[PDB]
Write a protein that binds this DNA or RNA. Sequence first.
RNA 1: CGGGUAAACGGCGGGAGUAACUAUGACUCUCUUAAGGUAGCCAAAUGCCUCGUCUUCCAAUUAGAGACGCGCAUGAAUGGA
RNA 2: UUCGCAAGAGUGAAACUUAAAGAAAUUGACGGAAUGGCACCACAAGACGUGGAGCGUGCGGUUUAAUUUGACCAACACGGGGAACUUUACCAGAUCCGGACAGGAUGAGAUUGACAGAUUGAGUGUUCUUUCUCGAUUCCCUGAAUGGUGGUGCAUGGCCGCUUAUGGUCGGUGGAGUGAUUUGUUUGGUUGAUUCCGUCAACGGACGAGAUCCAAGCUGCCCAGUAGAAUUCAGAAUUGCCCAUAGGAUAGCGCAUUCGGUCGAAUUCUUCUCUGCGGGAUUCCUUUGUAAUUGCACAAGGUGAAAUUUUGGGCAACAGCAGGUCUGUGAUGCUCCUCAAUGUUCUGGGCGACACGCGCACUACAAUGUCAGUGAGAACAAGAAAACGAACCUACUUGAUCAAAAGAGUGGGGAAACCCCGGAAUCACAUAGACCCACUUGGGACCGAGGAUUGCAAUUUGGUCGCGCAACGAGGAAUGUCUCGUAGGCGCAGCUCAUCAAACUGUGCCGAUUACGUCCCU
RNA 3: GAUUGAAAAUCC
RNA 4: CGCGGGGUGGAGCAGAGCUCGUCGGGCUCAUAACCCGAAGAUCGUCGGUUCAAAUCCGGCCCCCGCAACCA
RNA 5: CACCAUGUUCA
Length: 46
Amino acid sequence: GKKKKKRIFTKPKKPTHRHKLEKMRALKYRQDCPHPQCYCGKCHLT
RNA sequence: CGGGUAAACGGCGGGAGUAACUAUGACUCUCUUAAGGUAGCCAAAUGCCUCGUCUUCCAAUUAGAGACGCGCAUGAAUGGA
RNA sequence: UUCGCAAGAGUGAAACUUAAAGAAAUUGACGGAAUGGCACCACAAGACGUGGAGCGUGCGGUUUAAUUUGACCAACACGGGGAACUUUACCAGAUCCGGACAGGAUGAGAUUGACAGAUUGAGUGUUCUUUCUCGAUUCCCUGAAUGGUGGUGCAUGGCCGCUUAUGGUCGGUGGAGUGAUUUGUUUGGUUGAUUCCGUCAACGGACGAGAUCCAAGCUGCCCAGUAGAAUUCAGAAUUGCCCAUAGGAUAGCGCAUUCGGUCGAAUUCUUCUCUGCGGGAUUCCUUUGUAAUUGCACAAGGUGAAAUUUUGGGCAACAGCAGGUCUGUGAUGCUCCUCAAUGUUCUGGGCGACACGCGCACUACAAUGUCAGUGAGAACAAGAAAACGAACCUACUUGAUCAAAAGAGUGGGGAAACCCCGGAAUCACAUAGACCCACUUGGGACCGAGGAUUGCAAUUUGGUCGCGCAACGAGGAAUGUCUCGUAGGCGCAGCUCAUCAAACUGUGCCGAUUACGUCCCU
RNA sequence: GAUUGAAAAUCC
RNA sequence: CGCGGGGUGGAGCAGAGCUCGUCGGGCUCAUAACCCGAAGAUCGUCGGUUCAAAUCCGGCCCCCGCAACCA
RNA sequence: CACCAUGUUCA
Ligand SMILES: [K+]
Ligand SMILES: [K+]
Ligand SMILES: [K+]
Ligand SMILES: [K+]
Ligand SMILES: [Mg+2]
Ligand SMILES: [Mg+2]
Ligand SMILES: [Mg+2]
Ligand SMILES: [Mg+2]
Ligand SMILES: [Mg+2]
Ligand SMILES: [Mg+2]
Ligand SMILES: [Mg+2]
Ligand SMILES: [Mg+2]
Ligand SMILES: [Mg+2]
C-alpha cells in the first residue's frame, strides 16, 4: 500500500501565518480608498 | 576361407559430473574391450607405499588376533570359499 | 533348540514404533476398459492465414526518481485501458482542510484576505517585512471526525466470466434398502434436445429443452407537402449522308431520343419507398423410398418468397468455482493513513524509457501487379448548450491573377426535411496510357528542410519536397478461424474523442474452394 | 524483497 | 637416471571433427522425453621450419607410464 | 498391440 515511509526535509518547516493584532488601531488613525466600492486592503489598490 | 571348443593355453578397462550442511555419490555423461573380475576372500606363505588405519593383547607390541579394503600385483578345477 | 546334504523347515519373542490398519456396500471422479451418441472453440475434405520481414498495440523482462496497477483454455488492441495537462491511481516539490461536532485556552477584536519588496519553479501573502482589509463566519489543543483509485475479491454485496453448448435438474406420495442411497429420471426406436414413441413400482408434479422474444427474407391494410411514380401542356437540346489509331464484338427496325436548373405548369396514382398491426410453413404434400411391422420418425422429390429449430440473435435450469472485480458507485465488514496527510489541489516529470522474449494487429514481398486516367456504383449511422442566439454537423462559394494543407464568407439541418439524387472502396474500361520480372515506377521502414492546424501547453495531427541502397522475393518446428451471401477481399459509420484508430461495435460491397462426413485427434 | 492462502522453492 | 607416450569448444574424446553439454523457439497445465534451430577450441606452451603448422621440427611444462639389475 | 515418465508442504 501507500506506506508512510516518512520524508527527510531539506528546508525548515514554514510557520503558520498569524494576523497581526493592532490594538485600538481606530484610535491610532488614513486616506479613504478612492475606489468606489472600496494600500486599500479591500481593493488591494496601491 | 567358413564353423566348434576355456574343468584348451589363457584373459577378465578408463575419464568427467552428481543428494536441502558437509562428505560420498545410488544417479548421469563420455571414451573404450574378445570379455572388461562374478560369488567369495584380503595388508593373506599374495599390499609397493607400510612399522596401513581402527579394535584387542602388554608397563611398554616393526609381533599375534579381530576388523576395514583405493586389492603395486586377490579370485573361482591356472580351482574360489 | 530340533530337523535337513544344502536350500531351508518347525518352534517362536522383545525392545521400540504407531491412531488407526482393515471389511463390505453407496455416491462421485478417473481408466493407455467396453458401448452408443455428439462438436470445423474437434477432426476429415478444404480455404484464408499466423509462425519468417517492417511497423502498430498488449504482456514480460531490462532500465528508471518514478517508468501506477489488475489479469498469467477461461491473462497478453483485456480492464471499454486510443494517458500532452486533467484523467493518474506513480515520482520530485509546493498549496488547501474539504478535522464536522463537543469540551477547554482565547476573543469584538476570535478571525479573513491581501499591494509592494524576497521567499520561491512560481507579478504563488506560500511564508515573511509591512501596514491595510475582513469581521464571531474562523481560529488554538483535547478527544473526535472526515476523505482515500490505502489494504484484504482468502471478510462480503452486486455484477461478470467459466464449468457448459451441451441436455441437463429437483420435490411430493408410493416401492426398495440396517443404512448412506435408490426408483421414478429404465432399456428399444426417434430427435439438436430428459425430443418424442413404446415399455415400466411407480404415480403425479416443478424447472431447463422447446415455447416466448428481437431482427432477415415474402406478402395484406394503412400512409405520405420529412416517400415515390406515371401522364399531359408548354420551354428548350440532338436530329442522318456522315465509318478512328488498326477500330472487332455486343439488342432494337399512331408515335425518334433526350433535358433531378427548364429550379417549368397541370392532373392522376401508389410499381419502389415509409410502418403499427396482420398473413405465410405445418413435415404440409408425394414416393410400389427407409422405417413401421403401433408408433415416434426419417430420406428424396413437390409446392412455394422461404422446406426444416426457415435464418441470424436474445433469453436460458441446477449445482459449483476461495475465477475476476474492495480502480464503476453515497456497494460495503475489518484494518491502514489522516493537516510537511495514504485527504485535496497546484507545478515539473512518469504512465509511451530499451538488448531482449512472447500475444494480437496492420503493411509488404509485385504483373490475377504498380502508377496515371476515365466510368458506374452501397449500407449502418451521427449532428448545436445551463440559472435570443452562440457553440454541433453540414452544402455552396471564394481563396484563385494560380501547389497542397489551409483560411474566409454565405446559406441549411434538432435530422425520412440539411448533408443526400447520400458519386464509398472492392470493380470496370477496345484507356489502342506508362512500366516488363527487377528488391524494380514492387515495398514503404527510417530520417532531413519548410509550412499549416488542434490545444492553456505540441518541446499531437495533416500537407509539400527530399530519403528509400529498411528489411521483405512468400516464411522451420509449430499453430488459428471458418460451411453460403459463408470464408476471404473491400470500404463506410458509430465509438472513445479539443487533437489523435494499425482497436472495437455495427454496416453494406464483391464474392469462392471444400465437406455435407467422421470419431483418428481433441 | 518478489512469490504464496501460508510456507518451501526460485529469483531478488 | 635412462626409456618412452600424450597434451584441442564447458566435459569425455577425433584428426577444427564427434558425443554430451549450452542457448533461442516449439510441443506440455507444467517438467522430462521429443521437435526445429543457434553459438562455443589455431589444438599444453613457446619458438623456429615450412606457401602455410593442431599438424612440421625443436625447446620447455605437465601428466602418464616402462625399466631401474648381478656374494 | 512402437514409444507414451513425473507432479514440494500444509491448507
Ligand atoms: K545339525
Ligand atoms: K524359520
Ligand atoms: K520416441
Ligand atoms: K523423480
Ligand atoms: Mg569384488
Ligand atoms: Mg589386500
Ligand atoms: Mg612377544
Ligand atoms: Mg589380520
Ligand atoms: Mg592384493
Ligand atoms: Mg591378477
Ligand atoms: Mg489475485
Ligand atoms: Mg483469488
Ligand atoms: Mg482499445
